[PDB]
Amino acid sequence: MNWTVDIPIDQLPSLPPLPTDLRTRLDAALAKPAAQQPTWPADQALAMRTVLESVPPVTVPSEIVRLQEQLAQVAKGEAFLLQGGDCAETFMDNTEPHIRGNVRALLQMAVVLTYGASMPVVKVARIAGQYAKPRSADIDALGLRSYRGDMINGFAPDAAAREHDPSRLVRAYANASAAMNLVRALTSSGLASLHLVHDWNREFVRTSPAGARYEALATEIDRGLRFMSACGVADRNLQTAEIYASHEALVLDYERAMLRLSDGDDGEPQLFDLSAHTVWIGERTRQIDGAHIAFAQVIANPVGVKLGPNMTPELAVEYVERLDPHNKPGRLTLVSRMGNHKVRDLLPPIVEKVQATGHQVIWQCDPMHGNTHESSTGFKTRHFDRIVDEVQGFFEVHRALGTHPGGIHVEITGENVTECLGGAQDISETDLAGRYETACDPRLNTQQSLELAFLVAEMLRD
Amino acid sequence: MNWTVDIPIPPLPTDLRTRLDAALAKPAAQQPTWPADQALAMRTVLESVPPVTVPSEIVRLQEQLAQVAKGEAFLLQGGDCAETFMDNTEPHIRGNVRALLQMAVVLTYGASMPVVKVARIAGQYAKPRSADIDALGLRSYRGDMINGFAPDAAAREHDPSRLVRAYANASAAMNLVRALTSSGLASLHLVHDWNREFVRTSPAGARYEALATEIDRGLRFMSACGVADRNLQTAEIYASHEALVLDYERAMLRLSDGDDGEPQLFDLSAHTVWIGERTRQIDGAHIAFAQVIANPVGVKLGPNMTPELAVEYVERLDPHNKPGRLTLVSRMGNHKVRDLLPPIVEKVQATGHQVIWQCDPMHGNTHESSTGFKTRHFDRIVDEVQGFFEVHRALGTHPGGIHVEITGENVTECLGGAQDISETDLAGRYETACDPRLNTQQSLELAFLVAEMLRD
Amino acid sequence: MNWTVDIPIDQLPSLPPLPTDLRTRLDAALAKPAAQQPTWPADQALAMRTVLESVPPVTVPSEIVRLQEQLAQVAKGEAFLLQGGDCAETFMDNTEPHIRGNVRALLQMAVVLTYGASMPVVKVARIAGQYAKPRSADIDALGLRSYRGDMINGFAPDAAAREHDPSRLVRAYANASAAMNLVRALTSSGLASLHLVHDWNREFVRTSPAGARYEALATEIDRGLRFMSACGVADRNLQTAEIYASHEALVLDYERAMLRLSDGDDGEPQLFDLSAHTVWIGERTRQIDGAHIAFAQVIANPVGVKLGPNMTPELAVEYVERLDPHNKPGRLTLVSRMGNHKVRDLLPPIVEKVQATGHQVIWQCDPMHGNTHESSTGFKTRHFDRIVDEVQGFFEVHRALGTHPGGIHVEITGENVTECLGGAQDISETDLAGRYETACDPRLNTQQSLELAFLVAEMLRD
Amino acid sequence: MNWTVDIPIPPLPTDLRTRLDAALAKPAAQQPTWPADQALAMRTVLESVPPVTVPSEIVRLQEQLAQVAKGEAFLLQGGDCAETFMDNTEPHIRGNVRALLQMAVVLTYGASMPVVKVARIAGQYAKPRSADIDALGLRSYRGDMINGFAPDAAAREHDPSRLVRAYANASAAMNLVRALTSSGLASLHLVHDWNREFVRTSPAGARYEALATEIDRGLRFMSACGVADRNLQTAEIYASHEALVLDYERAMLRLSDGDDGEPQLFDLSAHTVWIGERTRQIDGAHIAFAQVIANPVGVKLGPNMTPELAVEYVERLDPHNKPGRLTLVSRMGNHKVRDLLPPIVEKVQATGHQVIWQCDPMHGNTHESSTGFKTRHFDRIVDEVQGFFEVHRALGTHPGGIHVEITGENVTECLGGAQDISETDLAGRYETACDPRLNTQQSLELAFLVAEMLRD
Numbered sequence A, C: 001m002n003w004t005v006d007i008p009i010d011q012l013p014s015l016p017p018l019p020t021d022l023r024t025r026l027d028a029a030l031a032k033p034a035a036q037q038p039t040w041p042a043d044q045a046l047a048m049r050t051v052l053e054s055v056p057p058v059t060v061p062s063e064i065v066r067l068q069e070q071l072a073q074v075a076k077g078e079a080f081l082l083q084g085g086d087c088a089e090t091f092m093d094n095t096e097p098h099i100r101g102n103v104r105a106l107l108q109m110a111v112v113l114t115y116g117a118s119m120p121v122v123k124v125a126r127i128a129g130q131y132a133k134p135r136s137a138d139i140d141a142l143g144l145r146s147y148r149g150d151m152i153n154g155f156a157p158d159a160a161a162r163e164h165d166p167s168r169l170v171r172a173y174a175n176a177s178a179a180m181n182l183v184r185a186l187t188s189s190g191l192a193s194l195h196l197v198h199d200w201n202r203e204f205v206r207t208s209p210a211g212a213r214y215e216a217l218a219t220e221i222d223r224g225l226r227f228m229s230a231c232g233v234a235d236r237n238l239q240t241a242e243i244y245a246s247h248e249a250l251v252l253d254y255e256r257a258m259l260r261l262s263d264g265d266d267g268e269p270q271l272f273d274l275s276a277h278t279v280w281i282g283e284r285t286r287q288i289d290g291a292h293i294a295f296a297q298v299i300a301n302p303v304g305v306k307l308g309p310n311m312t313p314e315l316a317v318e319y320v321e322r323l324d325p326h327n328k329p330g331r332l333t334l335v336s337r338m339g340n341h342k343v344r345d346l347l348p349p350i351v352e353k354v355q356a357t358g359h360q361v362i363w364q365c366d367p368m369h370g371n372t373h374e375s376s377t378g379f380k381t382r383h384f385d386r387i388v389d390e391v392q393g394f395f396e397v398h399r400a401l402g403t404h405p406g407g408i409h410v411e412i413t414g415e416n417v418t419e420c421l422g423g424a425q426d427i428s429e430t431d432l433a434g435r436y437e438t439a440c441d442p443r444l445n446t447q448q449s450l451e452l453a454f455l456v457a458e459m460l461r462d
Numbered sequence B, D: 001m002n003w004t005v006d007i008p009i010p011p012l013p014t015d016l017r018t019r020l021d022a023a024l025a026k027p028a029a030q031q032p033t034w035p036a037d038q039a040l041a042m043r044t045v046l047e048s049v050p051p052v053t054v055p056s057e058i059v060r061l062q063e064q065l066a067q068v069a070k071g072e073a074f075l076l077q078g079g080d081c082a083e084t085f086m087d088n089t090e091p092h093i094r095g096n097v098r099a100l101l102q103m104a105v106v107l108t109y110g111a112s113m114p115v116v117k118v119a120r121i122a123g124q125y126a127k128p129r130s131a132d133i134d135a136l137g138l139r140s141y142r143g144d145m146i147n148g149f150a151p152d153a154a155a156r157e158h159d160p161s162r163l164v165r166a167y168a169n170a171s172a173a174m175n176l177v178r179a180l181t182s183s184g185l186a187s188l189h190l191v192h193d194w195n196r197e198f199v200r201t202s203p204a205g206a207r208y209e210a211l212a213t214e215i216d217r218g219l220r221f222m223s224a225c226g227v228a229d230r231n232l233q234t235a236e237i238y239a240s241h242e243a244l245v246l247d248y249e250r251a252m253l254r255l256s257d258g259d260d261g262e263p264q265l266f267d268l269s270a271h272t273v274w275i276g277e278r279t280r281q282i283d284g285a286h287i288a289f290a291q292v293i294a295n296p297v298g299v300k301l302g303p304n305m306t307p308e309l310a311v312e313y314v315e316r317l318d319p320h321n322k323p324g325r326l327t328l329v330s331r332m333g334n335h336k337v338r339d340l341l342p343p344i345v346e347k348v349q350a351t352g353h354q355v356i357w358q359c360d361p362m363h364g365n366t367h368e369s370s371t372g373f374k375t376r377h378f379d380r381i382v383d384e385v386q387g388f389f390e391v392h393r394a395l396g397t398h399p400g401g402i403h404v405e406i407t408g409e410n411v412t413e414c415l416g417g418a419q420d421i422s423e424t425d426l427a428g429r430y431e432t433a434c435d436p437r438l439n440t441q442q443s444l445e446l447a448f449l450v451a452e453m454l455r456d
């Protein structure tokens, strides 16, 4: 009588274990200390991991190999990386309309960035697994154990909901696989048709308060599309697009259980994390001798590491030597998150020192996480202008060094939320209370996220 | 050992609500017996989940099925008799997708036209039973969406939680099917290399070597003409199951957007579904439900079928005369198909409608071995397809497709084939949770044999 | 000892004649009076016609059927027609560099017009047969029989060269077939690669005195091309383009001898003029009951008729009823040539009356032939501004009526000649003496012709 | 009855002028004997005409021939023995293009790799003669570029005007070949329908029916896989002839632009040319001329060829080791090819160069019938190709192509084939101006036979 349904779990499948040699390596890596982990019983975690070891994967190795090839092109300055989605996915909002809205928002941004960059845009959603977060404080403002994301505990402000529940590992997988199934369906459908997506962009221009500002570029894009059609271009590639899946690799119980061995028809068999295509390590879990970095070493997926204002050029180089030991362009993405007031100063010496190693990382801008403040109305928020300005500074840093501004990583949604201040809608502190729906950080709403794409497209054209 | 889901706390057009309600108020056979309050809670959860399929895919399938109905493509439908939660694994799903693709390339070459590939996967978790009590005195197993296979009373109790578990398993499997078909798994060259290995290491491989080599030379010719890899890297595999548990199917209904004609109810648990022999009551809820949804649908037709009732199905389920909207799945027994099928085909053809005529050569050819196993002889399966082709050839109508039960596993479930599986062999790997499936070699051998029927 | 080589002629092939019924129709049509015909002996003309009846055709029926399909799209407002080349081709200048230059100039114009129009451009060269012209006066300023074009007599100002020589019919065919062979080779080569052609346009923008003016659009075109490549567009259609062949059908001895019966695998067999893909009838030979119009009725090719300032709406309708009797969109092109000072007034009532017939002609602008004057330095010339202004007025006429401004027909060359006044080079009366090379009317040089395309592209965008 | 052309009234790089001059100062066999002043005037005209081919096409052909040399494509070269001005007509040109395309589809399927199509057209107007005086006591006919076929003295005088007439005819023919190959003439489906008609109405059609049906099923399979019309509508047919008359070839030289490496002399009278058995003197002008031009070139090799001299041709004509730059055309007689060819192939292969090994099964198998006609037996032609394949099969080398004399006409020139053309039949339609050609049926029958050699 709690209005919840229990779904029984079975670990019946008989599947061979991972090879002894790879397990031996994995065990040695996971013996390292791991920050920010859930505190549930080991016996229960083991049982859940055992279930997840036998489930169909979310992604397959050939997709990850294909992504790696596309990311190598980004690292070489021949493509641009767009990564975006919810700050925190919730099980409650993991619905068709919400997923479709986020996929749509990403695609809308991508066509604008493609035109502005004059090169392919690799589209990576924060989706199908972004269910876990780190917490700075053990006790939140309400005197409760902190919400850690839906893979660990519940958002609701009650004690029972905040207890760490290892059954969530399986609920997370169910939600991730369901979302990924839909993302695949949507991208191979008309939704990712280039003409349809740009029609939405055209509507945005009509009805945005600053639409006059973006009308020139929008018209130019439309004339570019029309030109393709006029040139008799095969329409086949226009109809569908590839959207990859990503999340912060935080809960090692989940990530380790989703490891699979590739079939070895591409090269040599090895460990892939098939919970996603690519994952990144967060600022609070990137300890150089910690388990997260060690885990990222062992897997074959492309990986990223968040770099905040305390980053040194020397530590950045250590990440490069640990995580890109074979010098594979695009294998490693370094995600700069410095604050708009600091990026121009702190980023250049890191870029210089890393470039001198001879490795080719992707330099990606996260203009969100270094630009967060609390409004006077109590809401955790970010100003659009500061977000835009960090990307601007990021481009200036790279332009001065002759290096590639390789992409952005943003928190966005297709919803008309009121979470970030500013944009052409001029969202105010007062407005924030209307639709502040994020379970964690403030997201750019659908209009703000498209406006950012127009602005970044202009930076690319400069 | 429970994961737990929260029960969530825009209305249909009035006419669709009225029609759905009317369909569901009709009597429904073979339904689980679980409490209505619990079923409702499970349905409420399922009404909020991401769909297994989307309407544009179903519209696309309908277009491809119209081509089949017009005699311009061929329908291959196949997979497990019963999917189980236990066996819903990567190797098993990959094996079945592979088996289907292997058959498809052979049938494509033999038919000289496209083959529409529809898998009995991502939802085939419910079955009817003639008897509530089985041979062991237990309440019958009705598939994993309803109760458990294990032969004990507690496991056989009907459990509405399985509705959600079924969705979880379906969506996981569908995700993988999509991934596998966009991969190199569905590259033509790769798939036909597997067929070449089969020819080397089959006891009757000499028999199929000529056609296998001809296919290989056909593929090479494509490459030689400079037309390779344009469309060969990928394929579309659609999802199907018997629409049996109305609690599940109704909860997976979604209303389409106004982009295509008018808004319509689609069953997004699958691309296409069929109504079985025990649930096709003409005034029953299953047929009424099939009338309300926009998916392509099929109806199983067994040996008691009359030409007149077949026409009544056509007029109820294809009221607007949409080629391929309706598939009539003949399942008559190899000894009866030649006698019973022609007067049904004639009467239906005279209506001016264009159904897909599909052969189910499995369900009319089942017997029990002396070793206790429920089995089917390969020869009888082949012979029903043969007779089905003869019927259509004599009438000038289109033998439109097959519907088979198969797996990529090396099971020992059906007698015969080039491996010459015997009654004794059956005990080695009889793994089906319901009917005997053609194993990977038998299913490929059938494709070679059907390809020769197509060439004749 | 005249520095000429005689090439012997043989009429040896044994080929079946045209069907008796079609010949009966053709004879009845050619019994009509024909203006502007050469005055060579009938016996000699017959012998030359007999030779030409057996030679390989310049074009084939399937190409003409394909052109007709593309012209139907123009007539329906879904494509734009670009027709251009020398005023008069000469045998002496029928060389690889000159042909390549003209093909290049046309392609350069086409990519700009394609982008501006946002729809396909049908490319029809005045080439591989434009060897005959009408003369108003029997005696020219030098007291000689007038030059009639190289199919009839020689440009050189001497009596012997000006005598009408029926062997020219065969020399014309030799030159036409040679030129057509090269046009085919050039268009299926890298020359008609879209990227290569637009690079030339980019160079033009750098070095034109008014390049600043066209830089915006040129950059936009470049970004449009880059976008195609970024979208992963199949490059196959970009590599090659179709350039069709056209000329004024003037010398009926030539045109009748180049008639062939199609093989009848498309529809019914009928008469095609295989000296070209499409031909037009000139202002001085378009007598409604004359042989040229009657000849155009009998052939299946798409045809055009020049319409000058004396045209009435009623006569225009008669052309439509004679030449498009089966109401086939694009079969008939009406080519308006009214003078820039008259087009806005004279064109509308013609368009209205023709549109009311229910037929769909292509409305094409010839902004050259109504805008010709004689400079004070003696040269026959045209001002660029007047040429541009007639096209401008032509667009205004159609915009007001809701009808389709369907194309242009211009005289151009890839040479850096000094024939038309004005353009960004500001060609003056004095400049004309430097490189006035036309054997008849003044052509837009390569820079002027590309500048016109930019200007017309802007008209299309308005 | 003369058309008259005006004699027209940027220099080569110094090294190319020096090398061209040196090549042309060497002795040249089999040249016409006409006055130098008149030849010069004709050359001056030809130096100003539009070229028959362009350098980018020749570069593209070189790339495709490299693939042949590497064992990844097959070369089909064919057409009239001697083109005539009289027969340079639309029906005749279309017929020959059609015959070549028909052969090509069959060879493509049999080889399981692309076929490079090179026609002996648009320039094959000159031939050598062993004797200046022929059997009638007249100065020999040397082809229409030199003198006339008619058996009278005045017509046999060497006339430099024919140089221009040859160009006029070549450029006209090339224009049509281009038009025809971009049309539906070169649609695969259309061309193979003609092959199906041939099978119906050949006296030995039963023999080729299996392969013809297999090809048809291969084409249908392409269409079924959704890959039809992407590349099937058109094909590339290149132009070739024996480079014999140096006045013509030198006048048709053009210097390429700097876009590709460095500027080079291309002979733009054709895409590729070969040097004949009577003009391949190792220190002669023809070989020297072939060294200076950038086109792919070939050399005919008859039964007096040594392995050592073959190597000397390879080292002179392929000095930079460019696969496919050089084609060695074996022409040994069917009774000799097995004996003479292997030691040549071995010695050449040991050099590390990759030539194309091409079989000319015509010119070593010619005899005079008792009815006076110069003829060849079909069986001997087939047997030389057979032996050529056996030679390469034993050595592990690539049987790279054939070079045949054919026409789309139903002539009676070669004995045998399924029509069983006899000595008596030869008088009906013996139309060749030089050697006996395979007629349209014989040429297609050869393709079927060679396709089976390729499949073995």
Ligand SMILES: N[C@H](Cc1ccc(O)cc1)C(=O)O
Residues within 6 Å of the ligand: A009, A010, A011, A012, A055, A056, A170, A173, A174, A175, A177, B085, B086, B087, B088, B165, B168, B169, B172
């Ligand atoms: N074999 C599945 C495991 C599974 C699949 C999908 C899922 O969302 C959860 C769990 C079961 O036993 O139920």
Ligand SMILES: N[C@H](Cc1ccc(O)cc1)C(=O)O
Residues within 6 Å of the ligand: A091, A092, A093, A094, A171, A174, A175, A178, B005, B006, B045, B048, B049, B050, B164, B167, B168, B169
């Ligand atoms: N909204 C999802 C519902 C869900 C998704 C996936 C699934 O397999 C079952 C149930 C949740 O709360 O968990």
Ligand SMILES: N[C@H](Cc1ccc(O)cc1)C(=O)O
Residues within 6 Å of the ligand: C009, C010, C011, C012, C055, C056, C170, C173, C174, C175, C177, D085, D086, D087, D088, D165, D168, D169, D172
């Ligand atoms: N058969 C050609 C006719 C011909 C072809 C080409 C040409 O340019 C002129 C004349 C001849 O007798 O010469």
Ligand SMILES: N[C@H](Cc1ccc(O)cc1)C(=O)O
Residues within 6 Å of the ligand: C091, C092, C093, C094, C171, C174, C175, C178, D005, D006, D045, D048, D049, D050, D164, D167, D168, D169
């Ligand atoms: N410039 C050409 C030369 C020419 C072209 C074509 C041809 O067949 C022969 C000669 C002329 O004066 O006629």
Ligand SMILES: [Mn+2]
Residues within 6 Å of the ligand: A087, A088, A369, A411, A440, A441
């Ligand atoms: Mn965040």
Ligand SMILES: [Mn+2]
Residues within 6 Å of the ligand: B081, B082, B363, B405, B434, B435
């Ligand atoms: Mn079954």
Ligand SMILES: [Mn+2]
Residues within 6 Å of the ligand: C087, C088, C369, C411, C440, C441
């Ligand atoms: Mn003019």
Ligand SMILES: [Mn+2]
Residues within 6 Å of the ligand: D081, D082, D363, D405, D434, D435
């Ligand atoms: Mn010969």
